[PDB]
Structure formats: C-alpha cells, structure tokens
C-alpha cells in the first residue's frame, strides 16, 4: 500500500534507522564500516555491529564532528542501510536525513547529489538534529500545555550544540557550537589510564574507556574537593573494572579513580582536552540566551532540554542549573543596584529537564514529522533537483540570504 | 602650539583605534589600537626573551597578544572599564607616545551622538582631576568630518569599530532630530567573519585571535557592487579564494567570506539585527529632512571612519541610493535618473577625518578663551562647565 518514509540520523558514534510512524528506531548501529586490508571487491564490506568483530577487516569511522569526511565510504554505508537493514526500494520511499548546524553547504550538496542521482529517491529533507529533539519532549509534556519555546543542548560523540527555539521559530543567528563531545571525553579517559593503568591492551583501551564512562563516571560539584575525597577516603570512591583480553581470554583488572569526574568536567573546563576553547557550557548558554530577543529570554531559561547520549551523566543538569542561577541572580542584583534599589525584579525560573528518550530523541522527532502530510510539501523533490540542481539543498537556518 | 607655547593636542579616543596628534597636523602622530593586555601563561606558547610587563598597552600588546589576555575598555562608543581606560590615556600622554606635560597643554576630544551623559561627564572629570589639562573641548564627530573636507553642508556617515552613526548638517545648523545610529561596525563584522570561518573549521575563540581576524578583514574582505555577480564568481570560479598565514605558521583559505561579512552593513539581518542598512537608512534620514535641504544632501554625502574602507562601498552606496530614488521619488522613471545629481565624497584619507577636523578646529580656535573649558572653571562649577557647549548637565 502507501509506504512510510525512511528516517536516518547518521551520527558520529551511532546511526539510527527505521521507518516513520514508529516510536523507537528499528536499528541502532555504530557508524562504522569494515573493509578489507577493483571489480566487485568494493562490496566486501560490513557496517554496524557486524564490523567490530571482523578480524581480517579494517574498521573505519567516516564521520567526525557530525560532518562526513570520506564520501567514498558513506555512499557504501548508505547502500547497506537501505538494501540490507531497512530493505527499502529508494525509488518509492521518501527520506529524512539529519545534519548538524555547522554542516557545510558542499556536504549538503553532495548528500543530495548522492540520494537523487545514485539512489533515485523521489524526495529528501535534510533537517537539523537538535531541533527534532525538542518536538519529542513536547509529547512527554501535557497535551495543550506544549511549550513551543525552549532551549536545546544536544551533545553526542562529535560535537555539542546550543539551539534556541522561540514560538516554533529557530533563532539561528544565536546558535553556538562547542566541539567537545563523547569522543573527547573518551580520549581523555583513554589518556589518564595509559599513564596510570598499564595492563590494558591497546586494542581494548577504547572499549575500556566507554565502559568506565557509561557506568562509573559522573559529574562533580567542585573539582579539587573530589581529589581529596578520593585521597582521604579511597575505599568509597575508587571502583574496580575487570575486563577480558581478546587474545588470551584472561581477565585484566584496574582501579577506577580520578577519571570518574574528570571526563565529564570538560563540559565545564574544556581546556582539559581542547586548548582552543575555554568557555564552559554554563556560560555558552547564557550568551545564547542574552543574544536572543528580550521577550523570549525568560521562557528559554525555563525550558532547557538536555538531549544526546553525552548528557546522560549523573548530576549534569543539577550543576548546569546551578551555574546559571548564580549567573542570572547576580545580573538582576546589579541592575537593581544601578537603578536605585527601588524595585526588586522578579527572579528567573531556570529549569533543566532531562527527558526519557535520549538515544533516539532526534530520530523520534523525525518519525513524528515524516508521518505528517506537511513533510511531503517541504521535501525537496526529484523534479526540483533536475531543474534547479543540487544547490536546492544549499541553505540552512543558521544563515541568511 | 598656542601663543603661550602650550601644545594643543587632539585625541579621538575611538573604540578600536586611538588617533592622537597636535593641532594643524595633516597626519596623526600615532595611531594605535585601544586595548590593554595583562600577562598570561599558555601551554602552546613558549617565550622567555622579551620582557612582558604586568600592564601592556597599545601596539606593544597587540604585537605580543599571544602572551596576553587583551580586553577592550570601550564598546559601542561607551566606556566600560575606567581603570583600563586610564592606563591607555597614560600611554597616550607618556614617553612612548606624545611625551607631553598635561598641566601645560590644551586637549580636544570627541564623543559620538546620542550617547549617555555620564560617559561625557566622567571623561571631563578625569581630564581636570587626574591629568589636569589646562583647556578641554568635547567636539562632535560629524562637524569635524566637514572641517577636513572643507564644507558647511553634508550628511555624514561615520562607521568605526563599534558605532555607525549618521548626522546631517546644513550650512552649519545641526539637525539632531535626524541623527540615526546603526548598531553595526567593524567589530560586529569581525564576529560574523569568525562565525563564517567556523564552517571551514578555523576556530578563533581567544581574545588575541580577535585581532588576527581584524587583520584578515582589513586585507581581504570587501563589498560587492552587485551581490548576484559575486555569487556567480564563488559558484562558478575559485578566484576569490585567497590565503592568509597566521602568526603560528598555519595557513587558511578565505573565499565567499570576503563579501558576505561586510554585507551586514546593507543586509543587517545576517547578524540578527532588525532594521535597514546604511543606504536605506541614509535615504530615509534625508527623506525626513526639509524638502528644500534634500537636494544638497545627495550632493554632499560624506563618508568617514575605517569601516567605510571596504573596497566597493561608495560605489555600492551610490547604486543602492539611485535604486531607491528611482523607486520612491521618481516612481520608476529611468529617463529622469540622468538629472539626479549625487556625489559621494570618498576621499582615501577618510580613515582619520574626525582627527583631521580636530586639527583644523584647534588651529582655528587655539588662541581663544571663550572656546575651551578651563581647570579653574571645573574647580568652581564642576561638571556644569559643559554648559558652554550647550550640554545640559548639573
């Protein structure tokens, strides 16, 4: 009968597939591709979970900071996503893809140049990732009490973004884009352990750092006070992680210490990893909002939506909601002093919510969308491509003209 | 130098660059940026040859910004940090620049229009108490832009680093009800050029790297006569792509970021500014004037400041005005456009006209006593000395 649309959120770490109308994706696979190490030999490849285990194949990660770097592989990564996993005849199903805000236009052009010419799709919509994550939260919210106005923090593996949304419209010229994400946290734990805990095989340092990050890590109120708690009372704060070697099948054990709070700290002290960035995320959010119009500053502080897998850290919003309320209650205090102290202005109600769906938040906002009829109007079309060309998909809301 | 030998000094005290010199000067003595830099330790940089003071200022800071945390005291014509602004004035009056004695000199200053009053009162409070200047005057940036051009009638366009203001004059009669300010200038462009370079992967987050992008702007960026023709060049060719080498040796490449950044003076919505550009604002300022004065404004449009030095700005400005004259005055009569007389004074010395005009008004009024504002007057009256200028303060 009438067929639903295909939805694909190709992220740095993990890739989210499925068809519209559904609540959770049909597949969630790493954004990896295993190749051998002319003719039909370019088809000897595997992607996803079928790529890690392959011994005689080389695993490649074609996506960095949300952008694609090798379109020779991503054109092979997408022809298994369609013909193996989804099993879709692309000439029938429309498509919804996702980009980060700072995706170059030439990457949007080569995307559409691939889908429309190679795969011959009849439609395509390249949406912004974190914007779809806000529509998902509104379903958790009461019906009718939907807050169209909200701020979004979407941090995954590649890059972190702060995107305000006011009355449904995206304030694109105030977006910020922090390059710190779950890959920088992982390589920082992968560093601390190489210095202290030798005995981790080099092939299993990454596997060991994600495991520490996902399980043991957390967020601290103050940094230097945690170092003392780990030193003065070490039995309570130092955990232990037993792994398994893949060659000898013998166990290896380590002690998990300062890397429990030091990884996530780079959200707030990003000069730990990247010296080209110093501002915390608690301050990036204040500049995003204070650069927005004066009327939608209060509703944006009151709905700050954490999305992405690298916001699952324990006590992430509790500190962000606290670093802001310090910053917001002072600014109002200073104005009250310069004016003359005659009016005590109303305080601002900061609120940082962390909604139930994070591993497939962006996909869900793409499935709700694609299941509408409005999607089939804004979708660029095969006809429009033949006439106007691949520059039909050149523009994004982050810029004008 | 006046009759009494007292040197007469002219300091612009701009938002991005200081222009200091003496009266009658046809150039300025020193032109240096208005920044103050304190030392800092960074892991990437290693230097132990040059001594780094605790307070570096001006050219010796911007040159050594790699080892510094620079900070601009002034923003959008307004002074934020006085303790960093006095350290700049000292450098401006010291052995490194204009080694003068303040107690035996006269000074002429400038403030932009429709600024707060406490920013003017607090400057005069500083020149008579801290430096104890003998004679002070606070001029209008527009009127000075005419003295250098040798005029009495002309709508001024003065765009700098923080402020872009428009002030019409007619035979020396101020019309402050027509003064307008656009909130866009060379600093709001320099930010937009970083937000564009960020798409290529170049990150300039630090305070020192803000100057590095200014130099990238002053060198490469320009204005497009017909923005459609420029977009064809960037889509069809790759000749606009230039290269800039940074202090750390890293090379970058800059293309369509050259005409897109300063287009925010004419399409200001690209930086989240609601309103109209410098052309549709200059045409609407004139159309507010008395109908008999409009004919002499089009003939005497005067540019100034260093944000008017984008290659192609006056030609672009002449174009957009004639499109509006055709569309709103003439209602679409191309045949009458030949009679439309417009002349945009774009002299290449328009970078310093607010200073040159201050050299001209000083040399004309150096030897008069009813013009300046004396230390004795400030001791007696206080900030009410400004009533000589007509500025109502108490």
């Amino acid at each position: 009968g009438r067929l639903p649309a295909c939805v694909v959120d190709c992220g740095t770490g993990y890739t989210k597939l499925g068809y519209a109308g559904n609540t959770e994706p049909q597949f969630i696979i790493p954004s990896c591709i295993a190749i051998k190490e002319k003719g039909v030999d370019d088809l000897d490849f595997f992607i996803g979970d079928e790529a890690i285990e392959k011994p005689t194949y080389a695993t490649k990660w074609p996506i960095r900071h949300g952008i694609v770097e090798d379109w020779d592989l991503m054109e092979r990564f997408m022809e298994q996503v369609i013909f193996k996993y989804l099993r879709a005849e692309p000439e029938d199903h429309y498509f919804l893809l996702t980009e980060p805000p700072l995706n170059t236009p030439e990457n949007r052009e080569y995307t559409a140049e691939i889908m429309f010419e190679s795969f011959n799709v009849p439609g395509l919509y390249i949406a912004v990732q974190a914007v779809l994550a806000l529509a998902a939260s509104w379903t958790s919210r009461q019906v009718g009490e939907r807050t169209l106005t909200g701020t979004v923090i979407d941090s995954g593996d590649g890059v972190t973004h702060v995107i305000p949304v006011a009355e449904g419209y995206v304030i694109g010229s105030c977006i910020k884009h922090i390059p710190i994400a779950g890959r920088d946290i992982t390589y920082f734990i992968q560093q601390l352990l190489r210095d202290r805990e030798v005995g981790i095989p080099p092939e299993q340092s990454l596997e060991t750092a994600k495991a520490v990050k996902e399980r043991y890590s957390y967020v601290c109120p103050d940094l230097v006070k945690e170092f003392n708690k780990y030193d003065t009372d070490g039995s309570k704060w130092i955990k232990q992680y037993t792994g398994i070697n893949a060659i000898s099948k013998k166990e290896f054990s380590i002690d998990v210490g300062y890397e429990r709070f030091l990884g996530p700290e780079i959200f707030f002290h990003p000069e730990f990893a990247n010296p080209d960035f110093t501002q915390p995320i608690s301050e990036v959010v204040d500049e995003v909002i204070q650069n927005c119009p004066i009327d939608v500053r209060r509703p944006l502080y009151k709905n700050i939506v954490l999305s992405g897998g690298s916001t699952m850290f324990r006590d992430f919003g509790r500190r962000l909601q606290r670093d802001l309320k310090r910053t917001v209650d002072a600014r109002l205090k200073l104005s009250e002093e310069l004016s003359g102290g005659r009016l005590k202005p109303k305080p601002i109600d900061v609120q940082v919510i962390t909604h139930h769906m994070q591993r497939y938040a962006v996909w869900f906002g793409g499935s709700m969308l694609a299941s509408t009829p409005e999607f089939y109007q804004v979708c660029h079309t095969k006809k429009d491509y033949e006439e106007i060309g691949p520059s039909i998909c050149r523009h994004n809301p982050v810029f004008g003209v | 130098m006046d009759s009494q030998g007292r040197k007469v000094v002219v300091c612009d005290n701009g938002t991005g660059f200081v222009k200091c010199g003496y009266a009658g000067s046809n150039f300025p003595e020193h032109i240096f940026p208005a920044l103050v830099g304190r030392p800092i330790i960074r892991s990437t940089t290693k230097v132990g040859n040059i001594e780094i003071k605790d307070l570096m200022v001006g050219d010796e800071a911007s040159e050594l910004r790699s080892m510094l945390e620079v900070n601009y005291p002034m923003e959008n014509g307004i002074v934020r940090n006085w303790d960093d602004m006095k350290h700049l004035w000292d450098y401006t009056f010291g052995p490194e620049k204009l080694n003068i004695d303040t107690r035996n000199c006269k000074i002429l200053l400038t403030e932009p229009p429709m600024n707060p009053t406490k920013n003017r009162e607090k400057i005069v409070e500083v020149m008579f108490e801290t430096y104890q200047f003998s004679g002070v005057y606070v001029a209008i940036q527009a009127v000075l832009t005419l003295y250098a051009q040798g005029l009495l009638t002309g709508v001024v366009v003065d765009s700098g680093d923080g402020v872009t203001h428009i002030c019409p004059v007619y035979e020396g009669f101020s019309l402050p009800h027509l003064t307008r300010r656009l909130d866009i200038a060379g600093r709001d462009i320099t930010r937009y050029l970083i937000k564009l370079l960020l798409l290529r992967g170049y990150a300039f987050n630090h305070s020192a790297d803000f100057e590095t992008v200014r130099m990238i702007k002053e060198k490469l960026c320009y204005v497009g006569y017909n923005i459609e023709q420029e977009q064809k060049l960037a889509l069809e060719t790759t000749v606009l792509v230039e290269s800039y080498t940074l202090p750390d040796g890293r090379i970058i490449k800059v293309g369509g970021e050259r005409f897109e950044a300063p287009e925010a003076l004419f399409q200001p919505h690209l930086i989240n500014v609601e309103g109209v550009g410098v052309a549709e604002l200059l045409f609407n300022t004139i159309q507010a004037a008395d109908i008999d004065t409009r004919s002499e404004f089009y003939k005497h449009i005067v540019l100034s400041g260093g944000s008017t030095m984008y290659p192609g700005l006056p030609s672009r400005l002449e174009r957009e005005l004639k499109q509006l004259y055709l569309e709103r005055v003439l209602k679409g009569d191309v045949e009458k456009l030949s009679k439309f007389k417009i002349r945009i004074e774009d002299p290449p010395r328009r970078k310093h006209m607010v200073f040159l005009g201050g050299a001209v008004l000083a040399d004309i009024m150096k030897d008069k006593d009813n013009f300046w504002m004396t230390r004795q007057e400030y001791q007696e009256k206080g900030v009410r000395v400004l009533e000589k200028l007509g500025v109502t303060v108490r």
Binding site: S335, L338 | M74, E75, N76, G77, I78, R80, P116, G162, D183
Partner: peptide, 7 residues
C-alpha cells in the same frame, strides 16, 4: 549601555 545592548 546600561539597559539594552551591553556598553
């Protein structure tokens, strides 16, 4: 500035 804009 004090109200509106920074300066």
């Amino acid at each position: 500035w004090x109200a509106x804009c920074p300066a």
